[PDB]
Symmetry: C2
Subunit: 271 residues, 2 copies
């Protein structure tokens, strides 16, 4: 009783040409993934082995994302999916975040694909009168169907509402490029996690080179958030959090080069 | 096709604050957290855990948020959930984690812990530097400062050093690795109250601004500065006055935000 099969799924993010990119196998149709096996010492060590065989690309630190369950008797138990988030520098299968989630990028203004999404959500929310108000409240909180503001952290809740409304191909109407199994749900969890991270403490040294300009760091955070940053409040956050320091070198308008502090790297290594 | 299977356990960390003491829902005379397997009939992981909570405690539970998924140290996969309720709650956090309560200042048990951690860090000379860095970052072995959020990192260091019974023992042990789950829940709550304290499920319908701090102080295991505590609440726009007696209340936008965020 109480048996389950566990799949480990990796969301490995890089930033290339100011675009957030996720590591993929299957020609961009799936994330790197594999079953948790008896010989795997930990869940994370098991996933590291699956990333190695499928991509042979190095990965640094990993943080656990979320555990999802299926909603089957022949398998002997339920199936669970455990997602992890990793930040790396791309090395010479890398597809952009917003290929799968085009509505999540508002850097150059609200994307036009949202108009079509709002239209389909409204019809779904009005299709059943006894659930009308309860569905308008969810679609406004996540997508602003009634005029609510945009919260870039709600990436998962947006995708799950589209799934529940049958507006993504995985729900079997589709928006964005689908992925095999529940992998877009895992990717949406990784996007939301990283956006919660950068809003309060953007420790993203694994995404940057050893040294970088503040403009490079700003563009990297903007790519992850899918929004343009307020230049001043961003630079005050970085300084208040004591995250970076000048290296003493200049880059080319000349600009000083910065690195994340050793204490920031030390604290991450010991977590 | 050959599919591997493991035991799937759901573990609850349900916390209430009474008499300015953070307490966790336990079963079996405080030796364990409410737990149960993930079965076929369970629609979701959360609904399966709610069935075990009601069956084992018969105490109502409000919102639940997923904590962390652990493999055992057949395999066992443990999925923890955190819950905040209004008040078995006879056992506080610090019966199991006495070194995590610093509101009376640095607890005396840390002296014995620091002594044993130094001997473990000095046991092998090639790893002494890293072990001192780990123990100073988690416990302050070399004079480092205290970080209340590192409750999980502190426990797994004690486990790795053989300083808790589950691995010498400090604090009350629990069955299996339920101390690992409670540590994760304590760390989650202390991270939540630091940035944006949404704790309306722990507080009364109405409360004063001083009652709000002693609750937050109980969770963080630290005493806070009064003026700096209120500025955080003025900033995040979480509270509003009630007119009665000041008595305060959590705003409806905060209560609706949590109702729609899910688990």
């Amino acid at each position: 009783i109480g048996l389950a099969h566990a799949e480990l799924i990796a969301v490995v993010t890089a930033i290339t040409t100011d675009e957030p990119r996720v590591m993929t196998v299957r020609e961009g149709a799936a994330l790197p993934s594999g079953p948790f096996e008896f010989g795997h010492r930990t869940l994370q060590s098991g996933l590291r082995e699956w990333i190695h065989e499928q991509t042979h690309h190095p990965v640094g630190y990993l943080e656990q994302l979320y555990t999802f369950a299926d909603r089957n008797e022949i398998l002997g138990g339920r199936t669970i999916s455990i997602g992890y988030l990793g930040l790396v520098r791309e090395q010479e299968f890398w597809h952009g975040w917003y290929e799968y989630f085009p509505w999540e990028d508002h850097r150059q203004g609200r994307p036009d694909i949202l108009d079509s999404i709002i239209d389909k959500l409204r019809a779904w929310a009005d299709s059943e009168p006894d659930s009308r108000a309860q569905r308008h409240l969810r679609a406004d909180f996540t997508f602003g169907l009634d005029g609510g503001g945009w919260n870039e952290e709600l990436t998962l809740q947006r995708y799950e509402l589209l799934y529940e409304a049958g507006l993504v191909g995985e729900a079997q109407i589709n928006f964005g490029r689908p992925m095999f199994a529940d992998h877009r749900r895992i990717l949406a969890t990784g996007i939301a996690r990283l956006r919660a991270k950068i809003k309060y403490r953007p420790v993203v040294f694994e995404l940057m080179a050893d040294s970088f300009t503040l403009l490079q760091l700003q563009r990297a955070i903007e790519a992850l958030a899918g929004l343009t940053l307020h230049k001043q409040n961003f630079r005050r956050l970085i300084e208040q959090q004591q995250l970076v320091e000048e290296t003493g070198d200049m880059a080319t308008r000349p600009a000083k080069l910065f690195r994340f502090r050793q204490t920031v790297l030390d604290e991450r290594a010991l977590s």
